Structure 1
Amino acid sequence: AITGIFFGSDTGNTENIAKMIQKQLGKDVADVHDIAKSSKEDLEAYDILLLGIPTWYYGEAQCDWDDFFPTLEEIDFNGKLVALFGCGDQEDYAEYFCDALGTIRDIIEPRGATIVGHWPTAGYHFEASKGLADDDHFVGLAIDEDRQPELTAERVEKWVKQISEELHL
């Protein structure tokens, strides 16, 4: 219950990643939530937060998330450790590949969120992305279940390892 996984999902992908993630961390470690059925209180509740957001319709944010953003910007993230994950399509929307991860970064970083979990952009092949920490790493875990589902298992296995460390446990 140290970690609170909050996801948005429209066709189920991010919802599954969240669940693989919690499996890997374990239950007494983290609880998963559908941001759509979540509240401010529900988010402020945890100290370590994992936020999952898939990018929709040309750089936009999954609507459950889009609509929660205002509440999101009311939360003081100062004193909190966050990580970010999401889903994207690097071949049909290569020019907005996981931009949503970037939008949720901007809408939380100034708020004092201590972000963790940058992921190497090695192995992906998008044309552009607004969710990059540096131009060799996304700001979070980018999962492409549409084009690279075969790499989804390992990406999560390794990324969760990576965050477990950065967070310490």
Structure 2
Amino acid sequence: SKLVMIFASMSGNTEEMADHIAGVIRETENEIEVIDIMDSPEASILEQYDGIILGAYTWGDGDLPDDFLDFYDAMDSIDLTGKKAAVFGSCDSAYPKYGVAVDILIEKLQERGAAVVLEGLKVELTPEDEDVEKCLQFGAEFVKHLS
């Protein structure tokens, strides 16, 4: 199957997670295109993939990264019925609205008809060894839902 991952990372923590998850998926008989939100992908591309993984840190007052805002708006016009999806991100418990960008992106995927097949994966700041193993389990469990 053909998969897409779109991630946002300012300081590198969510990108570390993205690279682990994608590297695990690449050891299966599936292809994945990993795209940084800074490179301005259009949301319509999500319609062309069998599975979708989004990654995002949380910013400001429990908001999406600034660079995700246009893409998020454009998601109101796409049809994701049938697709398998999941979301991850790095987080900081110095903030009350912890990792809520993950929850916001999950909600939007649900609204557009995607089957969200995993709980959101939240890691505190830079992954430690146990967090890295959680990234491996996320990728392995995601693939199981593909046909």
**Matched letter for residue 112 of structure 1:** G
Other-structure match for 2:38:
36
Q: Which among 73, 80, 85 is matched to residue 82 of structure 1?
A: 85
Other-structure match for 1:151:
130
> How far apart in 2 are the matches of 1:164 and 1:29?
11
1:31 match: secondary structure: strand
Name the Cα RMSD after superposition. 1.9
Spell out the pairing of 1:43-122 with structure 2 (5 A cutoff).
43-90=46-93, 92-93=94-95, 95-118=96-119
Which structure has more relative contact order (CA 8 Å, sep 6+)? It is 2
For residues 80-131 of structure 1, give each alpha carbon's deviation from its aligned partner in whole angstroms, at most 9, with x where no partner exists.
11111111012x11x211111111122221211110111xxxxxxxxxxxxx
Aligned residues: 144
> How far apart in 2 are the matches of 1:35 and 1:74?
18
For residues 114-161 of structure 1, give each alpha carbon's deviation from its aligned partner in whole angstroms, at most 9, with x where no partner exists.
10111xxxxxxxxxxxxxxxxxxxxx1112234x63432111112222
Other-structure match for 1:22:
22
Normalised TM-score (structure 2): 0.87
**Matched letter for residue 29 of structure 1:** E
> How far apart in 1 are the matches of 2:2 and 2:8?
20
Q: Which runs of 5+ in 1 are unaligned?
A: 119-139
> How far apart in 1 are the matches of 2:57 and 2:14?
6
Other-structure match for 2:8:
8
Identity of aligned residues (%): 28
Q: Which runs of 5+ in 2 are unaligned?
A: none
Normalised TM-score (structure 1): 0.76
